[PDB]
Amino acid sequence: VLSPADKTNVKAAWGKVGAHAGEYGAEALERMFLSFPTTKTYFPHFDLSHGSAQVKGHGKKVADALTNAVAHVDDMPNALSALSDLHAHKLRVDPVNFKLLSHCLLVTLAAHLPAEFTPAVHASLDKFLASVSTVLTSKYR
Amino acid sequence: GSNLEMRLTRGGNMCSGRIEIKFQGRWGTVCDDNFNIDHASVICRQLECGSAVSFSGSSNFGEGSGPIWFDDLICNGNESALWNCKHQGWGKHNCDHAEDAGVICSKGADLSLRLVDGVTECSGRLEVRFQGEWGTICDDGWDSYDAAVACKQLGCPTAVTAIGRVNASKGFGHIWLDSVSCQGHEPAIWQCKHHEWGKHYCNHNEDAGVTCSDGSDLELRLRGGGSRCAGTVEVEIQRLLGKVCDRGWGLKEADVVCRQLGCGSALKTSYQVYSKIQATNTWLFLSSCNGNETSLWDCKNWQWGGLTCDHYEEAKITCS
Amino acid sequence: GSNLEMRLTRGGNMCSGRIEIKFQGRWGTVCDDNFNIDHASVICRQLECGSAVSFSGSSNFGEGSGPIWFDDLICNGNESALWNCKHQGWGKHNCDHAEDAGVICSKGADLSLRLVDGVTECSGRLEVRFQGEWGTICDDGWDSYDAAVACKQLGCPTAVTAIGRVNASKGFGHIWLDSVSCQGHEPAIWQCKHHEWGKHYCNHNEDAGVTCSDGSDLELRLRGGGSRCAGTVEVEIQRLLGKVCDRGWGLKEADVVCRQLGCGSALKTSYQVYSKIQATNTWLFLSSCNGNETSLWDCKNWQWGGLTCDHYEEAKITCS
Amino acid sequence: VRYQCKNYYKLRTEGDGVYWINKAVGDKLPECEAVCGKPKNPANILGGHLDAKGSFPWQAKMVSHHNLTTGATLINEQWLLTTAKNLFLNHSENATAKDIAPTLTLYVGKKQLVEIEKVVLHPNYSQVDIGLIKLKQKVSVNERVMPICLPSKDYAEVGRVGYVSGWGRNANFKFTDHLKYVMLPVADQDQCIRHYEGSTVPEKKTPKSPVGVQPILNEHTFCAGMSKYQEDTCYGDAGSAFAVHDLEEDTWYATGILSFDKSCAVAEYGVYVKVTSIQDWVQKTIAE
Amino acid sequence: VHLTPEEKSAVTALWGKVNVDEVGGEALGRLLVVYPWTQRFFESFGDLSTPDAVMGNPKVKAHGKKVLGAFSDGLAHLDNLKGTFATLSELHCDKLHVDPENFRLLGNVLVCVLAHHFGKEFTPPVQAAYQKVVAGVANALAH
Ligand code: HEM
Ligand code: HEM
Ligand SMILES: *[C@@H]1O[C@H](CO)[C@@H](O[C@@H]2O[C@H](CO)[C@@H](O)[C@H](O)[C@H]2NC(C)=O)[C@H](O)[C@H]1NC(C)=O
Numbered sequence A: 001v002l003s004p005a006d007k008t009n010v011k012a013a014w015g016k017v018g019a020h021a022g023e024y025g026a027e028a029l030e031r032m033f034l035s036f037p038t039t040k041t042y043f044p045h046f047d048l049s050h051g052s053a054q055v056k057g058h059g060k061k062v063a064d065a066l067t068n069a070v071a072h073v074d075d076m077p078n079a080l081s082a083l084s085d086l087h088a089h090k091l092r093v094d095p096v097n098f099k100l101l102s103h104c105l106l107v108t109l110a111a112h113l114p115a116e117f118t119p120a121v122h123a124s125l126d127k128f129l130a131s132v133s134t135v136l137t138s139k140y141r
Numbered sequence B, C: 001g002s003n004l005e006m007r008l009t010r011g012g013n014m015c016s017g018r019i020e021i022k023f024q025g026r027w028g029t030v031c032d033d034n035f036n037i038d039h040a041s042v043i044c045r046q047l048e049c050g051s052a053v054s055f056s057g058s059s060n061f062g063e064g065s066g067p068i069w070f071d072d073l074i075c076n077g078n079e080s081a082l083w084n085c086k087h088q089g090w091g092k093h094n095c096d097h098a099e100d101a102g103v104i105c106s107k108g109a110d111l112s113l114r115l116v117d118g119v120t121e122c123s124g125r126l127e128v129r130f131q132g133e134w135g136t137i138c139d140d141g142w143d144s145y146d147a148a149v150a151c152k153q154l155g156c157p158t159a160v161t162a163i164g165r166v167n168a169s170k171g172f173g174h175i176w177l178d179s180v181s182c183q184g185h186e187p188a189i190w191q192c193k194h195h196e197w198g199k200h201y202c203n204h205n206e207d208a209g210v211t212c213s214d215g216s217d218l219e220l221r222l223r224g225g226g227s228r229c230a231g232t233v234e235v236e237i238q239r240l241l242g243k244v245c246d247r248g249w250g251l252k253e254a255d256v257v258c259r260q261l262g263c264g265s266a267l268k269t270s271y272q273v274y275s276k277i278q279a280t281n282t283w284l285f286l287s288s289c290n291g292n293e294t295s296l297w298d299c300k301n302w303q304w305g306g307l308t309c310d311h312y313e314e315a316k317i318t319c320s
Numbered sequence D: 001v002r003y004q005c006k007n008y009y010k011l012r013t014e015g016d017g018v019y020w021i022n023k024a025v026g027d028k029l030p031e032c033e034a035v036c037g038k039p040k041n042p043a044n045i046l047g048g049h050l051d052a053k054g055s056f057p058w059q060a061k062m063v064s065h066h067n068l069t070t071g072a073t074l075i076n077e078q079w080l081l082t083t084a085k086n087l088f089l090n091h092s093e094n095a096t097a098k099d100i101a102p103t104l105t106l107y108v109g110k111k112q113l114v115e116i117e118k119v120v121l122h123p124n125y126s127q128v129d130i131g132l133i134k135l136k137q138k139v140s141v142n143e144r145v146m147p148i149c150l151p152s153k154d155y156a157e158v159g160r161v162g163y164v165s166g167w168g169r170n171a172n173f174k175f176t177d178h179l180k181y182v183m184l185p186v187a188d189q190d191q192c193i194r195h196y197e198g199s200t201v202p203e204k205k206t207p208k209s210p211v212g213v214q215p216i217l218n219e220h221t222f223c224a225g226m227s228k229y230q231e232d233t234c235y236g237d238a239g240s241a242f243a244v245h246d247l248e249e250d251t252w253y254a255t256g257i258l259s260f261d262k263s264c265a266v267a268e269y270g271v272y273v274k275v276t277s278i279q280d281w282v283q284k285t286i287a288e
Numbered sequence E: 001v002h003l004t005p006e007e008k009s010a011v012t013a014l015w016g017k018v019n020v021d022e023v024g025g026e027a028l029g030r031l032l033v034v035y036p037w038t039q040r041f042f043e044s045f046g047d048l049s050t051p052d053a054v055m056g057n058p059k060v061k062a063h064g065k066k067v068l069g070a071f072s073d074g075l076a077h078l079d080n081l082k083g084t085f086a087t088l089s090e091l092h093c094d095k096l097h098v099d100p101e102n103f104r105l106l107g108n109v110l111v112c113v114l115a116h117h118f119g120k121e122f123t124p125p126v127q128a129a130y131q132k133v134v135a136g137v138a139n140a141l142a143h
């Protein structure tokens, strides 16, 4: 659960992510595809090579979704309702892939924001990504 | 009445907190249903706590215990006590204890505003005092109307009222106000619609500020480009020299600057460098300019400082 | 009473068998619930039978018959009798007679170690005798210290002790001993730290062996490269041909081999073939070693046989 | 002679077992039934508490056709309690219990696969998220397989800590390889409805769940919060019993059956349907 | 599965610059902070409530040093991980009753710590290699 301190840390961390969110998300997608190739089975229509324009655009979309979730941290299920329906029903993405993507997002943020990735901020961002994943994986059946 | 005693619970001081009334010797709360500033005025005047700074209704002061006594209180403001509004019964309510109404009263809140760490007495970080301790304002939702209200409230020029703490660092301590929604006409910054006091997820990097100026000490120029109107935009605001952050800096804002300096349209968002310029750590951040503005100061919500232009360059330009 | 005679029934001799305590004029057994080496050691020191080789609770020693006196005991190891731990109550239990606990003690044990299916009597698959039944040892946690302890125990020149069965096939029977952790000073392989006897997570492909040598019969040459200092690494250990597997075979081990043969450092783990060479079933495996060693035998924990280099390739070298 | 049977079982008869004509009942020849929730080695899912000792013999691992592991709870030697939402995985909303049953796979003990004879859903399974699984033959009760007992009391009083074992997903959203359990305290009911719905009054309730989906909250459910270590139950833990250890008689009771497993760690409370509410129905259903 | 020579070289190159006296303590403290149920196993380590208490704990630092030493030993023996981690897996399964998913969580937290320490030098390729390493360590240390 996201405590007010956790929401504060997440808001600050994503604020300093800032305009680099699109390429942070692209890097996280690249990390997920390399480290965990089983996640590539959900993108059979993407060029999954390094520096792929399609992967870059989808990372931009993912990070925009995460930014909207941070902006609506108190109403994330309503912010991600369309994405929850999408991932859970149309794409049928298994939740383990969501935890893998959350880990790769955390690795990207650690590699790109080392000064601001404190253990408290690491825990807060992990909790926020867990909340996003749970919202997106809930309607999964 | 004559035997009804009410109190304010869990609000810092005795003039703030949940509205709790004693009836049949039981302490019970009041709904937020149909609760507005008139009920808060009745309550604050009833307790001799002054005027009503604010009201709240979602059990923000904690969830109360006991029987909810009132649900739909119709108070027009001039009631001697809360148990004089019409309501709809003594204990009749379609409520929970997440709907307890609380109030914040004038003599308890003891509010005042000030500007700290700015280049002038009328610029810098905006700090509001709530219940005896000073705190800052989150810049979430802080815009030109908020700044205008704050500048008229501190009583010094309201001709141009920018946002953003000009060079002030982060504040310390509490952050009191978040998402202040002023229309520009409110007497003070706490009559405006805003989130509850201290209820936010802001850090002190986000501290709100204003730049109160009588449209006379804002100077803009282009330096480093070998002509008066082709170069890097150098803004001087109350003697503080800075630059424009080129985030959201297209040819619309560029044309606005060129018109302000009087050199036609903007041909290029870059310039042939003739000379170097001084390093200035304070920045000007334009949200979005329509394009037809007579001067850059008339654009909507231009921060003068308070943000970092780290992964963006300074706004350069070449007019005609 | 302090007159509780305890015996071990149906275990071959007096120090091995199923625990059985006489109290209240009747002989009763002990549950295996929370039964570990501590209870075994307590029972073994009760009969002055030495240390505890192992414990058993699957009624392998035979079905019990009588009132189960003990069910759950909390023994830390140092007790003056089994009726001193937190036996959670006398006579009360939740077992049956098939759940009774037995113990094998050092005095009554017939523990022995032997080498089978090796090139010499000093090498082969290591086998350990437990209650008279010969089983094998899993090579998990089997290192040069365990191999040295085994070589010292069996008795034949222990100057060079290598792990891994030499050309030996999968053993059969039980896997009595797993994850042995000797420090090199234990008199025998069973005084070391290891898993509970018979309990393991391995198969007979992982069967541990040992190679005991004085170092005179370990030869290592390069074949197929024309030059004496180029080719595959061919290994002669006890007149047995063999080649080094290249798993965990970097340039450091390559230059160790080059220095052993006396051709400086290593250039590449590949050679331009000059002549065909045959293939040999047994492989030398190099976990890791520092690279400054004057000989390949002297660097730590090299396995000779006991694994197949099928997933990996032969180890090659071209020295200078 | 006297009829007595082995461990984990109690003689089901009227007068002793001395007999072949019995002087008490004649030629009844009693059969002995298993034992309510008395695990050989009792205990003392995002979080930990690895079930190393097999402390929850009643827990069953139910896998659907499309390989989503869920939970079930042995209530007697032949029947199991689960949730209706568990049985309806990979099935139409109009699917019957006749064709749900051949789809399911059930594991008790270590991996002991048990065939399912029939599945019966609660009549009001939209409000009472319960389904009953019947095995083809009675499972053999041992130190790893043993029914939990259905409570004679309501152990759902706020503050009670029951042990929720589970086969569901973990902190990596991976179905757990080993059975786990958490020690969850039952929460204030009003806090739980207010956390999920709006204000515990029907005209002001709103879909306020911190997770996308809404639990089934009514008079037949209670809620247990996360433990002291912020660990809860996640997907696949539904159908697992909120086992309560009654220290008076040292017996384990299925106080609730986990209905809402979508509260992995975001929603503060997992919603358990009260077994005391469904106890009459499950008894009437075992009867036939 | 066998690790390619390039992946092994990347892993070794990045591990050679790892501060063993600090990285293990950082990883264990971050594990305790983010997954607080792992503090259950370290109640003997003293105050572990605040993140600053966990990261400032001398016992957490020493035990993380031991854990990172075990990681280094498994790195020197990547091709034989079940043999090198047999004793530790037995300890964690029987003496400690640590859930195997905690090993995977600590591996992920270690990868996060390595990224936090090495910035862009922790490329997605070397992260994939280290994910293979930590998965092998966790699988060798489990069941
Ligand atoms: C924090 C976690 C995640 C977020 C915020 C997220 C967000 C998004 C967004 C914004 C889109 C764009 C779709 C649209 O705009 O209509 C999308 C699409 C998609 N997502 Fe995710 N997602 C997440 C996790 C995952 C994971 C882990 C996977 C697979 C391993 C996945 C698989 C997909 C697929 C296959 C699409 C379809 C894209 C296409 O077809 O163009 N998502 N997601
Ligand atoms: C994932 C890789 C891990 C490695 C390589 C590792 C390594 C080690 C080592 C070397 C020891 C010392 C053994 C001894 O003292 O005899 C140890 C002990 C221990 N480990 Fe781990 N560990 C890992 C994961 C974990 C996790 C995730 C937890 C808990 C959530 C944990 C809990 C413990 C505890 C409680 C001890 C004993 C504490 C003590 O001796 O003071 N370990 N581990
Ligand atoms: C922002 O700029 C203002 C104005 O220059 C600074 O205030 C000055 O502080 C210096 C001390 O070095 C005094 O000598 C001046 O008299 C002050 N001027 C006024 C008008 O107050 C202020 O310190 C700066 N704030 C920062 C950089 O945090």
Ligand SMILES: *[C@@H]1O[C@H](CO)[C@@H](O[C@@H]2O[C@H](CO)[C@@H](O)[C@H](O)[C@H]2NC(C)=O)[C@H](O)[C@H]1NC(C)=O
Binding pocket: C117, C118, C119, C120, C166, C167, C168, C169
């Ligand atoms: C390992 O090698 C030894 C030595 O070559 C083999 O032992 C010989 O086996 C043959 C039969 O194949 C006998 O005729 C010899 O007398 C044996 N010699 C010795 C010294 O034992 C042994 O069989 C091999 N192990 C295998 C192939 O598993």
Ligand SMILES: *[C@@H]1O[C@H](CO)[C@@H](O[C@@H]2O[C@H](CO)[C@@H](O)[C@H](O)[C@H]2NC(C)=O)[C@H](O)[C@H]1NC(C)=O
Binding pocket: D065, D066, D090, D091, D092
């Ligand atoms: C049960 O699971 C199977 C396999 O996951 C589902 O079959 C898939 O359905 C989707 C959606 O129509 C198709 O795109 C796939 O091609 C199907 N895969 C197959 C048939 O192997 C099935 O729909 C599920 N049953 C439900 C949801 O009622």
Ligand SMILES: *[C@@H]1O[C@H](CO)[C@@H](O)[C@H](O)[C@H]1NC(C)=O
Binding pocket: B290, B292, B293, B294
């Ligand atoms: C600029 O154009 C906008 C329409 O986009 C209009 O609303 C505004 O009044 C114009 N301003 C001036 C100064 O003409």
Ligand SMILES: *[C@@H]1O[C@H](CO)[C@@H](O)[C@H](O)[C@H]1NC(C)=O
Binding pocket: C290, C292, C293, C294
């Ligand atoms: C090789 O270096 C190690 C240091 O790790 C040292 O202990 C050993 O003695 C050295 N060996 C030789 C032969 O120099």
Ligand SMILES: *[C@@H]1O[C@H](CO)[C@@H](O)[C@H](O)[C@H]1NC(C)=O
Binding pocket: D065, D066, D067
């Ligand atoms: C479920 O898993 C089994 C094997 O575990 C496999 O044979 C089957 O195809 C899987 N079904 C689906 C829908 O994934």
Ligand SMILES: *[C@@H]1O[C@H](CO)[C@@H](O)[C@H](O)[C@H]1NC(C)=O
Binding pocket: D122, D123, D124, D281
């Ligand atoms: C289902 O609901 C009805 C009325 O809501 C009730 O009378 C009936 O008992 C319920 N079913 C069971 C099995 O209790």
Ligand SMILES: [Ca+2]
Binding pocket: B032, B033, B099
């Ligand atoms: Ca209301």
Ligand SMILES: [Ca+2]
Binding pocket: B033, B071, B072, B093, B094
């Ligand atoms: Ca009302």
Ligand SMILES: [Ca+2]
Binding pocket: B139, B140, B141, B206
């Ligand atoms: Ca802001």
Ligand SMILES: [Ca+2]
Binding pocket: C032, C033, C099
């Ligand atoms: Ca037992």
Ligand SMILES: [Ca+2]
Binding pocket: C031, C033, C071, C072, C093, C094, C095, D040
């Ligand atoms: Ca027992």
Ligand SMILES: [Ca+2]
Binding pocket: C138, C139, C140, C202, C206, E082, E083
């Ligand atoms: Ca092995």
